[PDB]
Design a protein around this ligand. Structure first.
Ligand SMILES: *[C@@H]1O[C@H](CO)[C@@H](O)[C@H](O)[C@H]1NC(C)=O
Lengths: 44, 49, 108, 125
């Protein structure tokens, strides 16, 4: 099962990871049996 | 093929369904039966299994 | 060749009677006959495909039967919107789509 | 719920030509066969022509062989019937039937019909 959790919050920081607490809600649940070891992101 | 052909020579459409079980999450299922809700009485409930 | 005949031409009945119409073919067609309901004011519609198979969406009052060379259509209730002309068609022989003559049905 | 509307009917002198069209929009037109059915003013129905789902097999009625040419256009969902060399016995009513199967000469019958278009062959105004 491939699971993804997501969260979108505003922040005023520029060049730092904000200090705070925020839980992440589940988004979807994909029932596909892949044995995964690698990934890559996309840019526009 | 021709309508004049006998019963043993008329076309017969055939469809074969194959069912597989393997190490993957289950996808196809039969329709699940449901019943009307009963409140304020001692009942045996089956909520999502 | 093939010849298609209609025994009845004009029939009379009431709202609560039962009516049967027979269609006869010159040669064997092996249960390959069709019945059409032709309203005088609109486009004709099919009721029975095959010998005794009823098309979807039409009332179950119409009932057909017969095989070989002689066929018959039966109507059970005679609702007052059932006035039309009925034709029987064969789709088995070399002369393609032969239509029989009309069968007027009036209620009185 | 399927729609079959025809046009091109009217009055022409004997020996002249006219064309018919029949537009279908309520179903999938690219894989069904169609026919043309003639109804005399004072007689019963009579088959005229038919075409397959694709224009490969075409058959004509015995009395209209060598005079009528049926066509088909799968792109615009419409079929045509070019009537040539008309005589005085072709003043009947023409329907645009739909075949149940995909071929022309099958035990399957005509499933959906459409309202007829009236043609007339005579010398008048
Ligand atoms: C998972 O898939 C990989 C293919 O990338 C394979 O090498 C490995 O044996 C698989 N593991 C199992 C338990 O099937």
């Amino acid at each position: 099962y491939f699971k993804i959790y997501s969260k979108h919050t505003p922040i005023n920081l520029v060049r730092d990871l904000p200090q705070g607490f925020s839980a992440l809600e589940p988004l979807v649940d994909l029932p596909i049996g892949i044995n995964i070891t690698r990934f890559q992101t996309l840019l526009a | 093929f021709q309508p004049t052909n006998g019963v043993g020579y008329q076309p017969y459409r055939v469809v074969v369904l194959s069912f597989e079980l393997l190490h993957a999450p289950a996808t196809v299922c039969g329709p699940k039966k449901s019943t009307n809700l009963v409140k304020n009485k001692c009942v045996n409930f089956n909520f999502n299994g | 060749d093939i010849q298609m005949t209609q025994s009845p031409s004009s029939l009379s009945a009431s709202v609560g009677d039962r009516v049967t119409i027979t269609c006869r073919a010159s040669q064997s067609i092996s249960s390959y006959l069709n019945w059409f309901q032709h309203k005088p004011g609109k486009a004709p519609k099919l009721l029975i495909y095959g010998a005794s198979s009823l098309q979807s969406g039409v009332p179950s009052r119409f009932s057909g039967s017969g095989s070989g060379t002689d066929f018959t259509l039966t109507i059970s209730s005679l609702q007052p919107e059932d006035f039309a002309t009925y034709y029987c068609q064969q789709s088995y022989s070399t002369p393609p789509y032969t239509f029989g003559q009309g069968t007027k049905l009036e209620i009185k | 719920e399927v729609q079959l509307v025809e046009s091109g009917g009217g009055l022409v002198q004997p020996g002249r030509s006219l064309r018919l069209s029949c537009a279908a929009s309520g179903f999938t037109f690219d894989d069904y066969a169609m026919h043309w059915v003639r109804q005399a003013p004072g007689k019963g129905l009579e088959w005229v022509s038919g075409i397959s789902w694709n224009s490969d097999s075409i058959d004509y009625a015995d009395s209209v062989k060598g005079r009528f040419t049926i066509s088909r256009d799968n792109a615009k969902n419409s079929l045509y019937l070019q009537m040539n060399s008309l005589r005085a016995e072709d003043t009947a009513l023409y329907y645009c039937a739909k075949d149940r199967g995909y071929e022309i000469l099958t035990p399957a019958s005509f499933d959906y019909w459409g309202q007829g278009t009236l043609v007339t062959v005579s010398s008048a105004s």
